[PDB]
């Protein structure tokens, strides 16, 4: 078939679709995607048609992306319209709350202030802020305008019912729903703030830049952050009410046909997109505005495949829209994310011994669990520093640090009889890594090595190795020992995965093992009874030091590659306080005074430590760690990181 059935919501849109269908047939070969045109009465009918497999694709505003995600529709974002420019594609805008500098209040102190809105029923100006504030509104919250009129002391809410709720028009009497009103729209709401009518303007990240050319003027303004702090107006990416995708093509989550849709649209923009100047133009139409796509669009970007609608819309936006749609209002239990049947059994027991203060969700991989913390299905997990990096890039923050005694030591272990090996040159040698992306076995050693050879294709530096998480055909999977689909997997059914697995990898096959300072002592001298380790002696192994010589294993203090940031618990900023407080209550009750090895927490850890200043991944991991990880991800995978980076480069 190879047919993409596009859904139109108007007769004009169907006519353009039909033109679209006919022109693509001149540019796409026989074996290529074709266009079919389905005509429905509304966006929701298109959503339902696609879910019913009567059509396949439609482009929607953010609100309808949410509707399309809810059961029984279950559509997913697949292609994004971008704007502005090809070198700097603009896919999202940011809803922000702008205030005057030194006005002395935060997001959680908006009650009784004067508010400026773009217009009632608009996203940045109304639905997003009121959605976020919904449970702060006084009861009864229906009708919504009466509740807002009793929340702010006075407002300019263009198009509000000022006859029944005059407070909403105090700053623009009559609540004029047109440009005839000086405070209507994006520039109008900001002017409401600039002129001193209101205390806060609910606008987009760009509004202040388009109305105030001089930076000195903009320096008299600030942004309200959802964490109840303020930031300058050029830091909206760390200080907004919501991140909003402008226009998104959706498709069924299963059954697609996403690859066809992208193939179709990518070819359409190459032949009929911006500045192509054919008789057919994808981003205009002689009759009507914004048919099928926005006329201001400059092209399409493929949405990363790990992305679902909740992750695409973002936590803040989904919170606001859900409050509007559902209208439900209440620390509460901390929902821990477990990774295996063995990890879930542990926290299940933790939950019942915590008497409800702990609850348990399970996902099949670390990244899935991270996605659940981002969208609110989960709340906290403990992660290696490399995953704290991914969690941080995805908007999460470190809340507590696992303390085992300043971090643990990353060391390079070699067999003592191999006296030739030095850190100075290990090219062509066989390497053993915890897994790609982890602190001790990858980010620290391969970050340092990156500085020496100025590239990160390490399978061409080492002859072969085991680095679980590498591509199955890579030479860094050749030494691994998992069988079938398990070979080179970053989990337990790969016997060379982890701190201990990488040491075993060295004992049996490798030349160098990148692990931590306790690994060799803990799996030598009979402490590990498994046949591969049982008769090993730790004086038969040395550590490579940075200067180029070697020392014994217990001399790691003066022969390590770098100090490693300890594993940390991560959560969202809105649960940071509660997770901080509930876990210290839990370790006071069940602390150091797992059934297998290292479930939920490292068994080395004695306590969960306070972070104080270092409550962001950049400040927790440190400057050089982040730089090295930034260097290594040019060669790295991680579909989650790709999805998070798509929303924040
Ligand atoms: Fe680690
Ligand atoms: Ru007409």
SS (H, E, C) 501-520: HHHHHHHHCCCEEEEECCHH
498 alpha carbon to ligand 1 midpoint, in Å? 9
482 alpha carbon to ligand 1 midpoint, in Å? 21
440 alpha carbon to ligand 1 midpoint, in Å? 6
Q: Binding residue per annotation — 328?
A: no
Residues with Cβ within 8 Å of residue 207, at least 6 apart in sequence? 96, 98, 186, 187, 189, 190, 201
Q: Binding residue per annotation — 450?
A: no
Which ligand is the nearest neighbour of the Cα of 288?
Answer: 2
Domains and CATH numbers, the chain: 1-92+245-330 (3.40.190.10), 93-244 (3.40.190.10), 331-407+565-649 (3.40.190.10), 408-564 (3.40.190.10)
Q: Binding residue per annotation — 498?
A: no
Measure Cα distances from 118 to 99, 333, 484, 606 in Å. 15, 38, 58, 53
Which ligand is the nearest neighbour of the Cα of 13?
Answer: 2
CA pair distance 257, 481, nearest whole angstrom = 37
CA 315 to centroid of chain Cα atoms = 10
Q: Binding residue per annotation — 201?
A: no
Q: Which of 211, 258, 208, 250 is nearest to 99 (CA)?
A: 208
Which ligand is the nearest neighbour of the Cα of 285?
Answer: 2
For residue 494, what is the DSSP state?
Answer: S
Q: Which of 224, 218, 193 is nearest to 104 (CA)?
A: 224
Q: Which of 605, 633, 648, 585 is nearest to 396 (CA)?
A: 648
Q: Binding residue per annotation — 247?
A: yes
Placement of tokens 């929340």 in the chain: 151
Which ligand is the nearest neighbour of the Cα of 565?
Answer: 1
| Cβ pair 476, 462 in contact under 8 A | yes
180 alpha carbon to ligand 2 midpoint, in Å? 27
Parallel/antiparallel/unpaired status of strands 381-383 and 154-156: unpaired
566 alpha carbon to ligand 1 midpoint, in Å? 7
CA pair distance 339, 362, nearest whole angstrom = 6
Q: Binding residue per annotation — 384?
A: yes
Q: Binding residue per annotation — 271?
A: no
Q: Binding residue per annotation — 438?
A: yes
Measure Cα distances from 215 to 87, 219, 229, 632 in Å. 25, 6, 21, 36
10 alpha carbon to ligand 2 midpoint, in Å? 10
CA pair distance 124, 317, nearest whole angstrom = 10
Q: Which residues of 303-333 are buried (b: 16+ CB within 10 A; e: fewer)?
A: bbebbbbbbbbbbbbbbbbbbbeeeeeeeee
Residues with Cβ within 8 Å of residue 9, at least 6 apart in sequence? 40, 41, 42, 43, 45, 46, 58
Q: Binding residue per annotation — 69?
A: no
641 alpha carbon to ligand 2 midpoint, in Å? 45
Which ligand is the nearest neighbour of the Cα of 437?
Answer: 1
CA pair distance 167, 365, nearest whole angstrom = 51
Q: Which of 409, 423, 411, 415 is nearest to 510 (CA)?
A: 415
60 alpha carbon to ligand 2 midpoint, in Å? 22
Q: Binding residue per annotation — 368?
A: no
CA 497 to centroid of chain Cα atoms = 26
CA pair distance 418, 542, nearest whole angstrom = 10
| Cβ pair 637, 476 in contact under 8 A | no
Placement of tokens 């080179």 in the chain: 488
CA pair distance 323, 137, nearest whole angstrom = 11
Helical H runs in 360-481? 366-375, 385-393, 444-453
Q: Binding residue per annotation — 61?
A: yes
Which ligand is the nearest neighbour of the Cα of 10?
Answer: 2
121 alpha carbon to ligand 2 midpoint, in Å? 26
CA pair distance 138, 161, nearest whole angstrom = 18
Q: Binding residue per annotation — 118?
A: yes
Task: Tell me, in Å, the resolution of the deposited structure.
Answer: 2.5
């Amino acid at each position: 078939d190879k047919t993409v059935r596009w859904c139109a919501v108007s007769e004009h849109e169907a006519t353009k679709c039909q033109s679209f269908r006919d022109h693509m047939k001149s540019v796409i070969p026989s074996d290529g995607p074709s266009v079919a045109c389905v005509k429905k009465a509304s966006y929701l009918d298109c959503i339902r048609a696609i879910a019913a497999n009567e059509a396949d694709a439609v482009t929607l505003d953010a609100g309808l992306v949410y509707d399309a995600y809810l059961a029984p529709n279950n559509l997913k974002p697949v292609v994004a319209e971008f704007y502005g420019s090809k070198e700097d594609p603009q896919t999202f805008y940011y809803a922000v709350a702008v205030v005057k500098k030194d006005s002395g209040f935060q997001m959680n102190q908006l009650r009784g202030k004067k508010s400026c809105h773009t217009g009632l029923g608009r996203s940045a100006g109304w639905n997003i802020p009121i959605g976020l504030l919904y449970c702060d509104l006084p009861e009864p919250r229906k009708p919504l305008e009466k509740a807002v009129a009793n929340f702010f002391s006075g407002s300019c809410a263009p198009c509000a019912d000022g006859t029944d709720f005059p407070q909403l028009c105090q700053l623009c009497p009559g609540c004029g729903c047109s440009t005839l009103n000086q405070y209507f729209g994006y520039s109008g709401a900001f002017k409401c703030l600039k002129d001193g009518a209101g205390d806060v303007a609910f606008v987009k990240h760009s509004t202040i830049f388009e109305n105030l050319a001089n930076k000195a003027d903009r320096d008299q303004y600030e942004l309200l952050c959802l964490d109840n702090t303020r930031k300058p107006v050029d830091e909206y990416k760390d200080c907004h009410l919501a991140q909003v995708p402008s226009h998104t093509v959706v498709a069924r989550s299963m059954g697609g046909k996403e690859d066809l849709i992208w193939e179709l649209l990518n070819q359409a923009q190459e032949h009929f997109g911006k500045d192509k100047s054919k008789e057919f133009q994808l981003f205009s139409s002689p009759h009507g505005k914004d048919l099928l796509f926005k006329d201001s669009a400059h092209g399409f970007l493929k949405v990363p495949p790990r992305m679902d609608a909740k992750m695409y819309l973002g936590y803040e936006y989904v919170t606001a829209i859900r409050n509007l749609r559902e209208g439900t209002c209440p620390c509460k239990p901390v929902k821990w994310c477990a990774l295996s049947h063995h990890e879930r059994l542990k926290c299940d027991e933790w939950s019942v011994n915590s008497v409800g203060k702990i609850e348990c969700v399970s996902a099949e991989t670390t990244e899935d669990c991270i996605a659940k913390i981002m969208n609110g299905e989960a709340d906290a997990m403990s992660l290696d520093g490399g995953f704290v990096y991914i969690a941080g890039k995805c908007g999460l923050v470190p809340v507590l640090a696992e303390n085992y005694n300043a971090g643990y030591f990353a060391v390079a272990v070699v067999k003592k009889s191999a006296s030739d090996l030095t850190w100075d040159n290990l090219k062509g040698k066989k390497s053993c890594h915890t897994a790609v992306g982890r602190t001790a076995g990858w980010n620290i050693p391969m970050g340092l090595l990156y500085n020496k050879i100025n590239h990160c294709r390490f399978d061409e530096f080492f002859s072969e190795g085991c680095a679980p998480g590498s591509k199955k055909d890579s030479s860094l999977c050749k030494l691994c020992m998992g069988s079938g689909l398990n070979l080179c997997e970053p989990n337990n059914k790969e016997g060379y995965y982890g701190y201990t697995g990488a040491f075993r990898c060295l004992v049996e096959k490798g030349d160098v093992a990148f692990v931590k300072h306790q690994t060799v002592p803990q799996n030598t001298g009979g402490k590990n009874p498994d046949p591969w380790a049982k008769n090993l002696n730790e004086k038969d192994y040395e550590l490579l030091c940075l200067d180029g010589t070697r020392k014994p294993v217990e001399e790691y203090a003066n022969c390590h590659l770098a100090r490693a940031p300890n594993h940390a618990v991560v959560t969202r900023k809105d649960k940071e306080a509660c997770v901080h407080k509930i876990l210290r209550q839990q370790q006071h009750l069940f602390g150091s005074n797992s059934e297998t090895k290292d479930l939920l927490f490292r068994d080395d850890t004695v306590c969960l430590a306070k972070l104080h200043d270092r409550n962001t991944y950049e400040k927790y991991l440190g400057e050089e760690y982040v730089k090295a990880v930034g260097n290594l991800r040019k060669c790295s995978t991680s579909s989650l990181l790709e999805a998070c980076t798509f929303r924040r480069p």
